[PDB]
Every structure is written in structure tokens, then in C-alpha cells.
Paper text:
High-resolution structures of [name] revealed that the side chain of residue Asp65 lies in close proximity to Glu62, raising the possibility that the two residues form a transient binding site for iron. Variant [name] was therefore constructed to determine the importance of this residue in [name] function. Variant [name] also crystallized under identical conditions to those reported for wild-type [name], and the resulting [name] structure overlays with that for the wild-type protein (overall rmsd of 0.09 Å). Protein structures derived from all crystals harvested without iron enrichment were free of bound metal ions, as expected. In the metal-free structure of variant [name] the side chain of Glu141 is oriented towards the threefold channel, and, in contrast to wild-type protein, the exposure of crystals to Fe2+ for either 2 or 20 min did not lead to a change in conformation of Glu141, regardless of the fractional occupancy of site 3. However, the rate at which Fe2+ binds to FOC sites in variant [name] was only 50 % that of the wild-type protein under the same conditions, suggesting a role for Asp65 in uptake of Fe2+. In contrast, the initial rate of mineral core formation in variant [name] is 0.35 µm s−1, only ~35 % of the 0.95 µm s−1 rate of wild-type [name], consistent with the hypothesis that Asp65 plays a role in transporting ferric-oxo species away from the FOC. Therefore, the impaired mineralization activity of variant [name] cannot be a consequence of increased stability of the di-Fe3+ form of the FOC, as was reported for variant E62A, suggesting that the replacement of Asp65 has a less direct effect on the exit of Fe3+ from the FOC. In the absence of Asp65, the pathway for Fe2+ into the FOC may be altered, apparently resulting in inhibition of Fe3+ egress, and suggesting that the pathways for iron entry and exit from the FOC are closely associated, such that disruption of the uptake route can cause a clash with the exit route.
Numbering used by the authors:
A (entry chain A), B (entry chain A), C (entry chain A), D (entry chain A): 5 to 182
């Protein structure tokens, strides 16, 4: 029985390029987390309490997603490498602009997973593609959700009354098409 | 065992300037109470039932805060001096104007507590600073709440539909960012 | 009514040096969070499942403490500034060494709060000292807890059997003197 | 409607090399089952009751996994071919040695699934890759579990006291990092 790079018994070696890609993806999700925190703060500063609560929950969820990846590296007997985290964007001219950045961030998170997925396919790492499959499924749902929230905010067309209605929807947990 | 100015056994004498400041602060909170009553009446006159219910509750709460201070003077064996109460402001041109006065009143209530706090610090009255600490904490929460209500009303920008939505939030007890 | 730097109604202006200190302290707690995450990973890599679970919970708690501070700045109508986050330490020669770093991190977190506290005292910001008081209380409890865990691990003197016993204590939630 | 090799209606023909690989994999899991039975006996002979209970359960689980594969061949209208089963290994010099064989067996079971998976990919048999995906996921979890048990036993470094503690963990069902 061989020992893996993190010292645990090694079921199968992992290509170092794939390992680097997973460590980088963990940073992408940690950065999404602090971005959603920044977005929750921006909404709280404008009394958009429902949007604040929504993004506060998204920040915690994104952090949990990042930790899920750290656990996979542990399970594969690979080293983790927690990286420097850039400061998030913190200023937006409107809720519609913020929601566009949020949608883009979710899509970019999926693109990162897709990049890791293609690398695992090139390396015939079926543990990793299997591990990623449900995370891609979750990303489909999150993209659908964030397209819904962005589209609904854009429909409001900057009207405060409509944005207050949507804010209350979010406070109630009405955050998807259902 | 010495007797305090109100006749009870005296644990520690209080500086007369600090006593005067506490008696004056009791008047500040009694005045906030009747101001919130006046604000509840103004809202009821315009069918803003949720704002009316909110300010009716705030008036009762502010009175309770004033009585809490009268109990502290009793506990310190100091005399109370319930003072003449000015008539409140009763006319506003808009809900946004009323909410600005409400926020100012809360901030001014905190400033009064801060004034008493600094006097107790100068007199090394640690009973009084300890007594005031949780009241300052409550003031932080109330300032955050009234900034939320004022900011949300200003976001409405005088639109009746948005103000009706916010009114219903208040009727439901949705009065903070949460 | 004046508007604060984050745009909300302003109850009382805050000294920019104190604001900078609070923003820096938020970074200190975010850094403690990712450090505890790194520590949980190190323990998981060595099958110390109870220590892994403990530090995983501490990472989430420290993040919550950081967000509590962001909410205070919102309440004071001050801007948040979420900063770049350094990479955590990730390598230790022993559990005793890791636990010493953990204790040091908790003590350093308290020192940061103490620094902010003294600045607020110099600026007579009683809202901020009142806000910090319960956080200092929590820090006392955490220092007592981490001295307990470090002391118990040092008592084990590197014996695997004793460290396995302590690991199981932590898995069961037995993490304090009680 | 065509009839498959086992006589049932045939949804889609299967490549004979892939069929042979699945039949061989069923033997691999049946062999893992009797190996875990042998391991449970070895532990019972040394009064390691928790390890005995653990491996007794693993033997039954591995058999269930093998039968799950026989059901898939039935569903694909393919013939099963239950093969001669070699005698398991039955002697180990230590618990650490046994646990290393156990980890190796789990990793080798995954390698067999990976071999079948690559053959299905080469034959564009998407039913089979979909069928195998959750089994690979389970293998990730089992490899993580057996690395945990092996690593914890190695940490004990042959000390009876530590091995008795771990034995009791296993009796209680504490068999993973959690
Ligand atoms: Cl907008
Ligand atoms: Cl208005
Ligand atoms: Cl140690
Ligand atoms: Cl051994
Ligand atoms: Na990387
Ligand atoms: Na795939
Ligand atoms: Na007076
Ligand atoms: Na004090
Ligand atoms: Na700073
Ligand atoms: Na103080
Ligand atoms: Na075969
Ligand atoms: Na596939």
C-alpha cells in the first residue's frame, strides 16, 4: 500500500495538473462566497432585507461547497492548498447590476467545474467525474435560480415598488420558479 | 447604615449632577414616548394602519424604558423627580419627514444616555455604567431599525403603492432587516 | 438627518481610525476562520476525526463572528471593506504544535478586539465598547477552552493512545472543562 | 422485438467483451466478500470483537454489491455466469497488515469497476456507465473509510491499549471520519 501526498493510504494516484485545477477551483468557490457576502452587505446598506438574507445564505452555501471539495482531496489522499483570497467586488450602481454580477459568478463557477471535469476526462479519472456530476446538477439549478432572480429584477425596470415586492419574496424564501 | 435621599438604605452616594442627568434623561424618554404617540396618530389619520400600530407599540416601549430608569433611582436610594412634559411635535408634510424625525429622536435618546454615561465615568459610578450598557445595546438595535424604516420609506420616493406595501409589512411585524 | 458613509441615516459619526481598526479586525476573524479550516484538514489527514470535526465547527463559528462585525458597521452606517485574505498556515509537526498555534490565534483575536476597544475608549464611542463587551466575554471562554484542549494534548505527551482518547472526547462534543 | 442471451426481451445488445468484464467483476466482489469474512474470523480469533463485527457487516455488504450487478445483467437481458470462487487469504501477522490488505482490496474493487467503465465508454454503452456511476461514488466513500481505519490502526503503532480503544469504536459503529 502506497501513501499519497497528504500521507494517507493511496487508492489511486492523481495527475498533478488535475490536483492543481481542483485546488484552484476551491479558491473560485471561496471567492464566490465572499462575493455573495459583499453582495449581502450592499443589499443591507439599501434596506433590501430579503436580498440581504438571500445572499447571506448563498455565502454560507458557497463556503460549504468549497469545503466539500477539500474533503474530496482528503478522500483521494491528496494535499489541500488553501490559497490567498482576493478582495471581492463591493460597489454596484443598481440591484440589476449586482444581480448580473451574481449570475455571471454562478456561471463562472460552473465553467471552473467544467474545466476540472474535462481535465479528469483527459486523465481517465472516473472518481473525479463521478464526484463532480452532482455538483454540475446543482449548478444547473443555481443558474436557473439566478436567471430567475436577475430576470425578475430586470422586469421591475428600476421601480422601487416592484423591487420592494421582490425583496419581500426573497425574505419569505420565494427564490425560485418552483 | 446611612439613608439615601429617597429614604431607603444607601449602598453608595450618587453625585447630584449625575442624579440630575438621570432625572433629565427620564424626561427625554417620556418625551420620546409621547412623540411616538403623536406619530402613531398622524399615521392613523392617513390610514397608514401598519405605521400606526408600529408607533403605538414604540410609545408604550419608550414609556417602559423611562420607568426602568425610575426603578434604578429607587434601587440607588435616590429621589425621582417627574418633570413637566412638553407637547410633542404633531405635524409633518410626509411620511418620509415623520420617519426622519423618528430616527433623529432615537439618535437623540442615545446621545442623552451617552451624556449620562460620560458623567458616571467621570464620577467612577460603575453601577451606573453597568446599568446603562444594555440600554446602549438596545439603542444600537433601535437606531439600526429606524434607519431601516426611514431608508425603506425614502426608497419608496413618495409613491403610494410602495408606501402601502411597507405599511402592510409593518402591520405584519416586519420592522427590521432581520 | 445626515447620511453616513455607507449611505444610511447616521446616528453618530465614527472616527476613521476606529473604522479602519474594525475593518482590520474583521480580516483577523476571517483569517482565524480559514486557519481553523486548515487545522481541520490537517487533523482529517491524520484520521483525528474528532479534532477535524471540532476545527470544522470553529471555522464556521469564526466566520459568523466576522459577519457579526460586518453587521455592526452596517448598523453604524459605516462602509465595510472586505480585504484580501492571506493563505493560512497549513503544516505542523505534531498535534501539540497545531494546538499551540490554535491557542495563539485565539489570544491574538482577543488582542485585536482589545486594540479596537482602546481606540473606541479614546474616542468615547460607547456604542462600540458596549458592542465589544460580550465578544470579549466570549473570548475569555474560548481562551479557557483552547487552554484546556492544548493542556490536555500536552498532557498526552505524544502518546497515540491518549491522543485517540482525546480525539473521541472531541467527537462526542466534550471540548471544555465543564 | 429481439430476445437477449438470457431469453428476455432485449432493449439493446451488449458487447461480449463488456459482458465478460461484468461477469468477472461480479467475481471480484464475491471474492472481496469472502475475504472480509476471513478478516472477520481473524479478528474474532484475537478477541477484536469490534473489528469482527465491522468485517462481518462488510462481507454481507460486498455480497449485496455483487448481487446488484447480477440484477443489472438480468435487466440488460444478458446471461449471468457465476464463477468458481478462490479461497481467501486467511493469515496476517498483525491488525495493521490485515487493514492494509483490506484497503488494497477496496482499491482493487474500484480498479475493476474502472476497467468495466472504460470498456463501456469504448462501446458507447451509456446504460452501463450510468449504472456504474453511483457505485464509483460508493467506492470513493469506502476508500476514504478504509484509509481512515488503516491510518488509525497504524497510528496506534501496535499498542494493545490503542487497538482496544479503536476496537470499541468499531463496535459502537464509529467507522468513518464523520
Ligand atoms: Cl435595479
Ligand atoms: Cl413619503
Ligand atoms: Cl502531539
Ligand atoms: Cl497492529
Ligand atoms: Na492551483
Ligand atoms: Na462522465
Ligand atoms: Na434634571
Ligand atoms: Na464602562
Ligand atoms: Na483596515
Ligand atoms: Na466600557
Ligand atoms: Na468473465
Ligand atoms: Na460517463
Amino acid at each position: 500500500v502506497a501513501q499519497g501526498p497528504n500521507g494517507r493510504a493511496l487508492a489511486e494516484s492523481m495527475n498533478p495538473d488535475l490536483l492543481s485545477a481542483i485546488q484552484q477551483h476551491i479558491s473560485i468557490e471561496r471567492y464566490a462566497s465572499v462575493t455573495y457576502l459583499a453582495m449581502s452587505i450592499w443589499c443591507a446598506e439599501r434596506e433590501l432585507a430579503g436580498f440581504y438574507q438571500f445572499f447571506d445564505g448563498e455565502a454560507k452555501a458557497e463556503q460549504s461547497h468549497a469545503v466539500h471539495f477539500t474533503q474530496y482531496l482528503i478522500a483521494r489522499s491528496q494535499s489541500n492548498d488553501l490559497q490567498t483570497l482576493d478582495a471581492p467586488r463591493q460597489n454596484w450602481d443598481s440591484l440589476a447590476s449586482l444581480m448580473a454580477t451574481a449570475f455571471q459568478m454562478e456561471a463562472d463557477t460552473t465553467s471552473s467545474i467544467q474545466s476540472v471535469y474535462a481535465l479528469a476526462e483527459r486523465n481517465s479519472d472516473t472518481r473525479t467525474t463521478v464526484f463532480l456530476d452532482p455538483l454540475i446538477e446543482a449548478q444547473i439549478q443555481s443558474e436557473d435560480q439566478f436567471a430567475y432572480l436577475l430576470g425578475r429584477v430586470k422586469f421591475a425596470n428600476g421601480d422601487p415598488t416592484a423591487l420592494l415586492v421582490i425583496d419581500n419574496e426573497l425574505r419569505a424564501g420565494q427564490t425560485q420558479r418552483g
